[PDB]
Amino acid sequence: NISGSCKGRCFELQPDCRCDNLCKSYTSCCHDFDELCLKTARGWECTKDRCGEVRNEENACHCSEDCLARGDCCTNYQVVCKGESHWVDDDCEEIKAAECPAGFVRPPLIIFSVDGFRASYMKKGSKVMPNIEKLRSCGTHSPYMRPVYPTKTFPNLYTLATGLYPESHGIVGNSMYDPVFDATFHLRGREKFNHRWWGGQPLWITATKQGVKAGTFFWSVVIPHERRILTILQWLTLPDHERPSVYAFYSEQPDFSGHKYGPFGPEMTNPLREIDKIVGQLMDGLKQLKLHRCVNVIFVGDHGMEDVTCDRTEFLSNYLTNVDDITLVPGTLGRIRSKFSNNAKYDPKAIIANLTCKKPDQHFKPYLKQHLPKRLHYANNRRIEDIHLLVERRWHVARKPLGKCFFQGDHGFDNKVNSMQTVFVGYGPTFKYKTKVPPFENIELYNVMCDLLGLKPAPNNGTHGSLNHLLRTNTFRPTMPEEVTRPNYPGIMYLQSDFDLGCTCDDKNKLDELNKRLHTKGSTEERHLLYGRPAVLYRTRYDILYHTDFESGYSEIFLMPLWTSYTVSKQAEVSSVPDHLTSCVRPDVRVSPSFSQNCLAYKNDKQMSYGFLFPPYLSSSPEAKYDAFLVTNMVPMYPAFKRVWNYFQRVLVKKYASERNGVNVISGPIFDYDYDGLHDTEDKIKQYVEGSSIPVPTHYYSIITSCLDFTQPADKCDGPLSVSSFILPHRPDNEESCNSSEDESKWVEELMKMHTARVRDIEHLTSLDFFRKTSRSYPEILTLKTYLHTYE
Numbered sequence: 037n038i039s040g041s042c043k044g045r046c047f048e049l050q051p052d053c054r055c056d057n058l059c060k061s062y063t064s065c066c067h068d069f070d071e072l073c074l075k076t077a078r079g080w081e082c083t084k085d086r087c088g089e090v091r092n093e094e095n096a097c098h099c100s101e102d103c104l105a106r107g108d109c110c111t112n113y114q115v116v117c118k119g120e121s122h123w124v125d126d127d128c129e130e131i132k133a134a135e136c137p138a139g140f141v142r143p144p145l146i147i148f149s150v151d152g153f154r155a156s157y158m159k160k161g162s163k164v165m166p167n168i169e170k171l172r173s174c175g176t177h178s179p180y181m182r183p184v185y186p187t188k189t190f191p192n193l194y195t196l197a198t199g200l201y202p203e204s205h206g207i208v209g210n211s212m213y214d215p216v217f218d219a220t221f222h223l224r225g226r227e228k229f230n231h232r233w234w235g236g237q238p239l240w241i242t243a244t245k246q247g248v249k250a251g252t253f254f255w256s257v258v259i260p261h262e263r264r265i266l267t268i269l270q271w272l273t274l275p276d277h278e279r280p281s282v283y284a285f286y287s288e289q290p291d292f293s294g295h296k297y298g299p300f301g302p303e304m305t306n307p308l309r310e311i312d313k314i315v316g317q318l319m320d321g322l323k324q325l326k327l328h329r330c331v332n333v334i335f336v337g338d339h340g341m342e343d344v345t346c347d348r349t350e351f352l353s354n355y356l357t358n359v360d361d362i363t364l365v366p367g368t369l370g371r372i373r374s375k376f377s378n379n380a381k382y383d384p385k386a387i388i389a390n391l392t393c394k395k396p397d398q399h400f401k402p403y404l405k406q407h408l409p410k411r412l413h414y415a416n417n418r419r420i421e422d423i424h425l426l427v428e429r430r431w432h433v434a435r436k437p438l439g440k441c442f443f444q445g446d447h448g449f450d451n452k453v454n455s456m457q458t459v460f461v462g463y464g465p466t467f468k469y470k471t472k473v474p475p476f477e478n479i480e481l482y483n484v485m486c487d488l489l490g491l492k493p494a495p496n497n498g499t500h501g502s503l504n505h506l507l508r509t510n511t512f513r514p515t516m517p518e519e520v521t522r523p524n525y526p527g528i529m530y531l532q533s534d535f536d537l538g539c540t541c542d543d544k545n546k547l548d549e550l551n552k553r554l555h556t557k558g559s560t561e562e563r564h565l566l567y568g569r570p571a572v573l574y575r576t577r578y579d580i581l582y583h584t585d586f587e588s589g590y591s592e593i594f595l596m597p598l599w600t601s602y603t604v605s606k607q608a609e610v611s612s613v614p615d616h617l618t619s620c621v622r623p624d625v626r627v628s629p630s631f632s633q634n635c636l637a638y639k640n641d642k643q644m645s646y647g648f649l650f651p652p653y654l655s656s657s658p659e660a661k662y663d664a665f666l667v668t669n670m671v672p673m674y675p676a677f678k679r680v681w682n683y684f685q686r687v688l689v690k691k692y693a694s695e696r697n698g699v700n701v702i703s704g705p706i707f708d709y710d711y712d713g714l715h716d717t718e719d720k721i722k723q724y725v726e727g728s729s730i731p732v733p734t735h736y737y738s739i740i741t742s743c744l745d746f747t748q749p750a751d752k753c754d755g756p757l758s759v760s761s762f763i764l765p766h767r768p769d770n771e772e773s774c775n776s777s778e779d780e781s782k783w784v785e786e787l788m789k790m791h792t793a794r795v796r797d798i799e800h801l802t803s804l805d806f807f808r809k810t811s812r813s814y815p816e817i818l819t820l821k822t823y824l825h826t827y828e
C-alpha cells in the first residue's frame with residue numbers, strides 16, 4: 037500500500053512503502069517518491085546567479101549557504117560560488133595518511149563500477165576522461181583486469197562483490213535455467229528477485245555482519261547518475277551511528293553504446309565523456325566535504341567489448357537436424373539443453389558429434405562442461421548446461437536464421453580474449469601513490485576490499501595476499517599452509533627377484549647391484565628441485581625418489597607420482613629411445629611390489645597405454661635413461677593423449693629451455709571426476725586401469741618456471757621468476773583439435789595454450805603447495821601463483 041509518504045526519508049538505509057535505491061525495481065515506492073526524492077528542477081550545477089540563494093525545496097541540488105552543513109549542495113557549489121578549483125585541476129599530491137573528519141573510524145570505500153568499459157578505452161586519456169586519468173596516474177592502476185567467464189554483467193558484478201567464481205555464487209549467466217527449481221532467471225522480470233539464485237556472501241553483507249555499515253550498491257535504472265552521486269555524498273555527512281563505511285556507484289555506461297556502435301566507433305567518445313563528468317562530480321563533491329584525501333575510490337569495470345555483427349553468425353540449424361526440440365542460450369557463448377523433459381529423441385552425444393569439426397574455420401567449438409579449460413572454472417553448478425559452445429571472438433552462435441543490423445559490438449567470450457579485458461584503478465590513502473601493478477583477476481578484489489575496511493573475508497576464490505602490492509598499508513600478512521603429510525625417503529631395499537609385476541626390460545648391462553650410492557640424493561635436489569619440495573596438504577603416504585635427471589614424490593596410494601621435478605638447461609639435447617628399450621619398464625628397488633603398478637594391467641586394458649612423467653628423451657646419458665623407465669615414473673595414458681604428451685616432452689620442453697635460458701618443469705596427474713576444481717578423494721575416482729587399483733587421471737599438469745631475467749639461467753636466478761602452466765584434459769580422443777590428423781607441430785601447441793592455467797588452479801586440483809623455498813617474499817610468490825600466461 038503506497039498511501040504512505042517519503043517525507044524526510046528519501047534514500048533511507050532501512051507492506052509499508054519504500055523510498056530507497058531499489059524501490060522502483062520492486063514497484064514498491066511511496067506515491068510521492070518521484071516528487072520528493074527524484075527532484076530534477078534546475079539541473080545538477082550551481083550557476084553564478086544561484087550563489088547564496090534562499091533555499092527552495094523544488095531544486096535537485098542547492099546553492100544556499102546552509103547546503104554544505106545539510107550535505108545537499110550541487111557538487112560544483114564551492115567552485116562556482118566560493119572560487120575553489122575543480123579536483124582534477126589540482127596537482128597530484130601524495131596521501132601519506134587518511135585525512136578524515138572528526139569521528140571517522142576508518143577511511144570509507146567508494147566503488148565506482150562501470151559496464152562494458154574496455155581496458156583500451158583508458159588509452160583515450162585526459163583529452164576524453166581527465167578525472168579518470170588523474171585517478172589512474174595518481175593512484176594505483178593495472179594495464180587491465182581480467183573478468184570471469186562468461187564476460188557478462190551480472191556474473192561479473194556479483195563476482196566482484198563476492199570473490200567467487202560464477203559456478204560458486206550461482207549467477208552463471210544473465211539468463212539461467214535451474215532444473216531443480218524448474219525456473220528461469222532473466223535480467224527482465226521478477227524471478228531474479230528470488231533469494232535462491234544469489235549464493236555466496238557479498239561485500240555489503242560481510243561488512244554488515246562485522247559491524248561495518250554499508251550503503252546499497254545497486255541502483256534502479258531510472259535514478260539519474262547525478263542523483264546517485266548526490267545520494268552517496270549525502271550519506272557521507274550522516275551521523276556516526278548511521279553513516280556507511282562502504283558504498284558503490286553503478287553505471288550502465290558505456291555498454292549500450294558499445295553494443296550499438298562497436299568498441300572503436302567514434303560514437304564511444306560521448307559516453308566516455310559523460311562517465312568522466314560523473315567521476316568529476318564525485319571528486320568535486322568529496323573535495324567540498326573535505327573527504328578527497330579520506331576515501332578510497334575504486335574505479336572498476338565488469339567486462340570489455342568486441343566487434344560483432346549480424347553477418348558473423350553461425351546457426352545450429354546448419355549442423356543439427358532438429359533445432360525445435362532444443363533450447364539454446366545464444367550469442368557470444370552457447371548453452372544447449374532439451375526444450376522439453378522426457379524427450380527420448382534427445383541425444384546429447386549425437387548433438388556434440390554433429391557440432392564437432394564440420395568445416396574448416398567453424399567459429400565455435402562444442403564441449404561437455406567438464407572438458408572446458410579448467411581456467412574457466414565453469415562446470416560445478418547445475419545451472420550450467422552439460423553442453424557448452426565456446427564461440428570465437430567476433431562471432432555469434434544462434435539457433436536458426438529466423439531489415440537492418442543494429443549491433444556492432446557484444447561481449448561474453450572467453451575471459452582471456454583481449455577485447456574482454458576491463459579496467460582497475462585504486463585511488464586514496466590506502467592505495468599506493470603513482471604505482472603501476474600487473475594485470476590481475478577480478479576474483480581477487482573482494483579480499484582487497486575487505487582489507488580496506490578491516491573485514492575478515494568470507495571463504496572465496498581470491499588468494500589472500502596476492503594483491504598486497506596494491507596497498508600502502510597491509511593489514512593481512514599471508515601465511516604458508518602447513519604440510520600435512522611428511523615425505524618418506526626410502527633407500528634401496530628390494531631385490532629384482534622380489535618383483536612379479538609382469539614387466540620386462542633389457543637392463544642386465546646396468547650396474548645397480550654394483551652401485552652402493554644408487555639413488556642417494558647426491559646432486560639431485562640442488563639441480564632438479566629449485567623452489568623446494570611441494571607440500572602435500574592432505575593425509576596420504578608418499579616417497580621422495582632421487583635420480584640423476586629428476587626428483588619425484590611418489591604416492592603409494594595412487595601408485596604414481598603426485599609431482600616430478602626436473603631442470604632442462606638451454607643447451608640440453610634430445611635423444612631417442614633405442615629399439616631394445618621401446619617397451620622397457622623396470623621395477624623400483626626402493627618401492628614395495630605391493631605399492632607398484634603392474635604391466636599386466638596395461639596389457640589387459642585395451643583402451644589404456646602408459647607414458648612417463650620424466651621423459652626418457654631428456655636423459656643426460658644412456659645409463660641415466662634407464663631411470664626414466666622405472667615403474668615409479670609411469671602413468672596411465674590414452675594413445676590419443678600420448679600424441680600430445682610425447683610432443684610436449686620430446687619437442688616443446690627443449691624449445692622452452694632454449695627460449696627461456698633453461699626451464700624447471702614440475703609435472704603430475706590430476707583427478708577431478710566431479711569437476712569441482714578440487715583434488716578428488718578416493719571415493720570420487722571413477723576409473724581405474726582394467727582390473728587394477730591404478731586410478732586414471734582426468735588431467736595432466738605441468739608448471740614450467742624460469743628466470744624473469746632470461747639472461748640468467750633457470751638454475752641461477754637471483755630475482756623474480758617467470759612461470760607458465762597448463763592443465764591438459766586426459767581424453768581418449770583428439771576431437772577437440774580439429775587439425776589433429778596432421779603432424780603434432782600443427783595442433784598440439786594450440787591445444788596447450790587453450791588449456792593454460794594458474795599455478796593456483798593446479799594447487800586446488802592437487803592439494804599441493806608449490807614454491808615454498810625461494811629468495812622471494814611470500815606475497816610475491818602468491819602473485820606468481822595467480823599469474824595466467826594467456827598467449828594473447
Ligand SMILES: *[C@@H]1O[C@H](CO)[C@@H](O[C@@H]2O[C@H](CO)[C@@H](O[C@@H]3O[C@H](CO[C@H]4O[C@H](CO[C@H]5O[C@H](CO)[C@@H](O)[C@H](O)[C@@H]5O)[C@@H](O)[C@H](O[C@H]5O[C@H](CO)[C@@H](O)[C@H](O)[C@@H]5O[C@H]5O[C@H](CO)[C@@H](O)[C@H](O)[C@@H]5O)[C@@H]4O)[C@@H](O)[C@H](O)[C@@H]3O)[C@H](O)[C@H]2NC(C)=O)[C@H](O)[C@H]1NC(C)=O
Nearest residue numbers: 203204205206235236237416417418494495496497713800
Ligand atoms: C571457490 O571458493 C568457494 C568458497 O570457499 C568454494 O566453494 C566451497 O566449497 C566447499 C568445499 O566443497 C563447500 O563446502 C561444503 O559446504 C557444505 C555446506 O554448504 C552450504 O553452506 C555454505 C556455508 O553457508 C554459510 O556461510 C556462507 C558464507 O560463506 C553464507 O553465505 C551462508 O548464508 C551461510 O551462513 C554455503 O556457502 C553453501 O553455498 C552453496 O550452496 C547454495 C545452495 O544451498 C548456493 O546458493 C551457493 O551458490 C553455493 O552453491 C555452490 O556450492 C555447492 C557446494 O556446497 C555446489 O554444489 C554448487 O554447485 C555451487 O557451486 C551451502 O549453502 C557442507 O555441507 C560441506 O561439508 C562442505 O563444507 C562450500 O559449500 C562451497 N561454497 C560456495 C559458496 O560455493 C570453491 O570450492 C572454491 N573453488 C575452487 C576452484 O577452489
Ligand SMILES: CC(C)[C@@H](NC(=O)c1cc(C(F)(F)F)ccc1F)C(=O)N1CCC2(CC1)C(=O)N(C)C(=O)N2c1ccc2n[nH]cc2c1
Nearest residue numbers: 058061147149193194196197228229231234253254284286
Ligand atoms: C544486482 C547484483 C549484480 C548485485 N550487485 C552487485 O553485485 C554490485 C557489485 C559491485 C562491485 F563493486 F562489486 F563491482 C558494484 C555494484 C553492484 F550493484 C546486488 O546488488 N545484489 C544481489 C542481487 C539482489 C540485490 C543485491 C539480491 O540480493 N536479491 C535477493 C535481489 O533480488 N537482488 C536484485 C537483483 C537485481 C535487481 N535489479 N533491480 C533491483 C535488483 C535486486
Ligand SMILES: *[C@@H]1O[C@H](CO)[C@@H](O)[C@H](O)[C@H]1NC(C)=O
Nearest residue numbers: 355356357358383386387390
Ligand atoms: C547429424 O547430421 C546428419 C547429417 O550430416 C543428420 O542425418 C542427423 O540427423 C544429425 N543428427 C543430429 C542429432 O542433429
Ligand SMILES: [Ca+2]
Nearest residue numbers: 708714715716
Ligand atoms: Ca574433485
Ligand SMILES: [Ca+2]
Nearest residue numbers: 770771773776
Ligand atoms: Ca581431431
Ligand SMILES: [Cl-]
Nearest residue numbers: 060061256257
Ligand atoms: Cl526501474
Ligand SMILES: [Cl-]
Nearest residue numbers: 136141142143
Ligand atoms: Cl580514519
Ligand SMILES: [Cl-]
Nearest residue numbers: 211212213365
Ligand atoms: Cl536460460
Ligand SMILES: [Cl-]
Nearest residue numbers: 358361381382
Ligand atoms: Cl532433440
Ligand SMILES: [Cl-]
Nearest residue numbers: 206417418419
Ligand atoms: Cl545450486
Ligand SMILES: [Cl-]
Nearest residue numbers: 514515516814
Ligand atoms: Cl610464510
Ligand SMILES: [Cl-]
Nearest residue numbers: 542543544545
Ligand atoms: Cl638383459
Ligand SMILES: [Cl-]
Nearest residue numbers: 575576577593
Ligand atoms: Cl594414508
Ligand SMILES: [Cl-]
Nearest residue numbers: 605698750751
Ligand atoms: Cl638451467
Ligand SMILES: [Cl-]
Nearest residue numbers: 614658659661
Ligand atoms: Cl643403451
Ligand SMILES: [Cl-]
Nearest residue numbers: 645674675678
Ligand atoms: Cl600408444
